[model samples]
Target: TCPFYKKIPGTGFTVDAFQYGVVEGCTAYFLTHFHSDHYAGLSKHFTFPVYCSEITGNLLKNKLHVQEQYIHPLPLDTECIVNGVKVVLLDANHCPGAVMILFYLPNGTVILHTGDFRADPSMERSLLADQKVHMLYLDTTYCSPEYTFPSQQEVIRFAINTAFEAVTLNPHALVVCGTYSIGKEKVFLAIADVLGSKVGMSQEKYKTLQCLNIPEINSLITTDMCSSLVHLLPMMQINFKGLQSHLKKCGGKYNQILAFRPTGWTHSNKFTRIADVIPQTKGNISIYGIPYSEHSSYLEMKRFVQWLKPQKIIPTVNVGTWKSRSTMEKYFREWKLEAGY
Candidate 1:
């Protein structure tokens, strides 16, 4: 049995369920993004017919080595009836190949599954305009009000300037950016470009980033470690202790480390000002856990929920626990109340 409900309501299709193996009544599969958590259980041995964006399809083949016959790369914004239901994919804005899936069911009901997205004004005009979403399967990753970080633009600006100052003050302080196997490309790319620093990454990670076909990313990567002041590292490796050892290993090329781990949870509830999204230092090391998140903020989610005012709301994430889901339910109820329910 699975913990979270992956099935899209009123359909035999599962949204992102490769991890659970064969579903009893599954007829089709859809992948919203290329994130590990979403595409976790998928492997080369996978045999299901899956529908996803063209970008995601290419990645699955290049990165995951999934068979081509099973891949159905749907072009964005184009309606294609699959399993007798109208389907359309819209840019999720979360990462490369990520999509917000829409389905017009056989009963003429409209449903939307926001795979994972950073809510923006464009969506209101481009997606929800003049369309009534009957059922909304939401990305509830940051469903709590505690997650009201500044906008991505603000955070990126902060990161670029902060990093610039750090490197300028300490020319020997190498900059390290925490990133996922996918996503968060903008944060690192901006930092490198502004600083005029070449990016250093492991060979395998370079190939993975290269798979994204990001022109800026591909051009910036260099194999020589000593030449680059900025390095792309996994989020798990951003700790001061680990990087201290890495700096030791690097010897004279770097005297200190200035690191950033950009995620939704990076910003603290205690931190109010955008500039204070800076860093904590432990001498020779400064860490900036900026609020650069892929998930929609609580405020963003609230606005979208109010905008939709759907007949039903489904939590695709943060739904595994009774307390978590129940807590999320309260916000939804309050949002409905705000609409004068």
Candidate 2:
């Protein structure tokens, strides 16, 4: 029995085989990006082959430390045959190694599964290539009629500027900005650049970030003004909370700013609940909430779907709304299209 089937959220797709079996026969599973929601299940029992970009491969290998040999490597625009399916990886532009995959069969039908993509004018020409995409899977994490994503460069600058300003505001203030643990060296570099310095990573971080060939990072704190300036992973920040007050004793108050570019925040959902925890503090502690995200906005989604002009649309990474599905369907429904897993 084939293990590929769509299990509707509110339907019979309860927490059972219907869910587990969905990815059972995934001959070659490609993670569009390294968000927790998208790559959550990969750690469990699995045997099928997996594919991701060069950077993603390095991430999983070092971060997750998952031992698997079946994973294939395909960077942007690279084509390879996996399990008789012609798979091509395209630039996702959301993150360094994020990719939009194209799966083609022998029957001339093709499906482009955009794990998560944003509209980047720099890559517009390649993304708009003419092709009859049979199905298009989009990242509608923010597909609601009332949401938007800020520019990546702008968001990056906001995060850096917020962190940098903290220095001048309080010479004793320590700045901490949150981002994914896997890939985001560039963001860290940006912050370091602002201070005319680089992030000061320990021997371990030095090895990790150094592998990426990031330039001028030995002095690590932007300008060596602080004793510590490192890109601490999100999960690891809690352990070092005590460092906050310690900085205070050194005449250094702390200002921790969290950078979140979530796809869902406007509505009352778990994400909003999580966002509610922003700027959490006790005494001598301060935080700033900045609106930043790593996925495409609704307009970006609509624009990309229109570019592909696929006959069908699907939601792969994040389970988008039916309206989002319907909107994409509307764009291509003239071809009698639909969207799902």
Candidate 3:
């Protein structure tokens, strides 16, 4: 999501700020990822210079059709100087292009801007092994304690095994996965790898994946409806009615359907979590709400904050009223105190 406020203190850089008229004192812009919520105001008539990871740059250029001259792509984990500020990009673990920017400002203040990332132990080991980050601007989408869910790998296995087991029991079961434009590529990939099956997608969806330009994903995807039992559909076609419509087109090839809606915000569900949020089933059809997320869980965020121990933590999301900001600050305080700050 677009960070509503920021200009990376002591620099002219605005991280993910493309939502309007020119920001005052703006010299360069930095985009973390190509999510529509983050890149809202960017257009072809953009005038300012922008810097982003190579993958992010690819999507920005092709998707938004931003001017090629202003689109400066930088290599990840490499130091580059822009406007007297040293900047480095680290994998955000969110999507292909998503990155957490490590800014070495002119005044020697080190700022770590996590532009939407799934916090993991690897970040502490590799991304901040010997570095000191003075300030941390984080993705606070799941800033509360109730947001804990399963890890990416664990959730992936859960879905795959679920689908695999169901397919073995029923010969003609179609495994349908709901997805956004990016971020969930791993689902179908892992499923295909495990089952040795081709992935079915629309021609336009295949074209969208090609723009991202990853070979392994594109290789597994086929436009032929009959070629692939595992179909990748957009998020909209995830309900019962949608499944019926999809099954109608299958020409009796499939008698039952198993679908998954992998998302993070399913943590919002009250009734399901009490029973451990199991899959929903009705006769030959099953629907699962997989709590797979790109954003760090609350515990993971706490762990990350405690590990990094930045002097100040700045939340980039859900900072509206004093109540929201204050609720988030409580965690920041707990994390900071626990870090011996």
Candidate 4:
């Protein structure tokens, strides 16, 4: 996610904004990444001027269905005056539509908030070239020593492998894998690439997929392409039990169908319905547990803070006591770090 600072009402000085409002009569700019935690509050109670990069704005509108009136689309590297505040957007390559921002206030103060990011070599090089970031705010979602996420590529490979094995075991059964629409398109495409043929999609999903400018769209297996690879084409069904009956009716030509379910993909997996519906065929409906989260890790946060060297490291998401603020405070302390609010 991004960091936003707002002017405190009746005071010339500003304070760190929480839930999009630091104080009254102040503008808010969002340095947002595509993760759930970043914009978690926007869809609910937030109703301020939420600034973001152009692509990020589109994602919020198209994907999250955020309202248009509150959107303030900023061009990358271009300084824009919003409600008498200067702002610039920077690229954060953590996900498809992530953006870190460099905000400049009238008092010659510069703050660079790194959105949920990785020290991805390519992105790091780009950040170095762009600007001399003054004050830095860090995203240390996994800043704890206990939290270490696998690399994105490794995570993807692992998830796919698990899904493949699960599908292979449950012949003529529906293998449901949970993934977001935009973020997991790559995984979906790779599945098609491996299958080397068309996959089934309903009319609605068919249209949505057709419109997406996915990297390997033509290479992907779609319902239209299913006619050629009729044997390989399996319907992506909504109902779990329906998969068995549908496959049986289709003469059980293919091994299994791939279905994406929302209730299945969450961090917590406790569903009685799923247990009853999905016949346990060698972990057929495997809840693929890949901590393929989009946020930055502890070391990554340390690296970023060391890189920018902001005056104050203001943490947005405070966990709790013992393992809460103190735990985060130790992050900078271990890195020989110091920051102000």
TM-score of each: 0.94, 0.70, 0.92, 0.65
Give candidate 4's whole-model lDDT.
0.52
Looking at candidate 2, the ten consecutive residues that score lowest on lDDT are: 7-16
Query: Which of candidates 1 and 3 reaches a greater TM-score?
Result: 1
Against the hidden true structure, what lDDT does model 1 obtain?
0.84
Residues 21-45 of candidate 1 have per-residue lDDT tens digits of 8887878899998988889998899
The prediction achieving the highest lDDT against the true structure is: 1
Off by more than 4 A, model 1: 2-4
RMSD to native for every prediction? Answer: 1.9, 7.2, 2.5, 7.5
Prediction 3 TM-score vs. true: 0.92
lDDT string for model 4 (1-341, tens) is 22343232222333224344444445454536555555555563446667776666766676556788877777776767766766666666566656776666666677766665566546566534555555566665567765555565765565456556645665344443444443444545555445444555444445445444456655554554224222221224444465455446555454555544322123232232222333233222222333455566666666666665556666655544566878888777767534432
lDDT tens digits, residue span 82-176, model 3: 99888888998998788889999888789999998989898876656767889889899999977777678877888778778888888788999
Candidate structures ordered by lDDT, highest first: 1, 3, 2, 4
**Each model's lDDT:** 0.84, 0.53, 0.83, 0.52
Which is better, 2 or 3, measured by TM-score? 3
Against the correct fold, how does model 2 do in TM-score?
0.70
Measured with C-alpha atoms, the lDDT of residue 241 in candidate 1 is 83
**2 against 4, candidate with superior TM-score:** 2
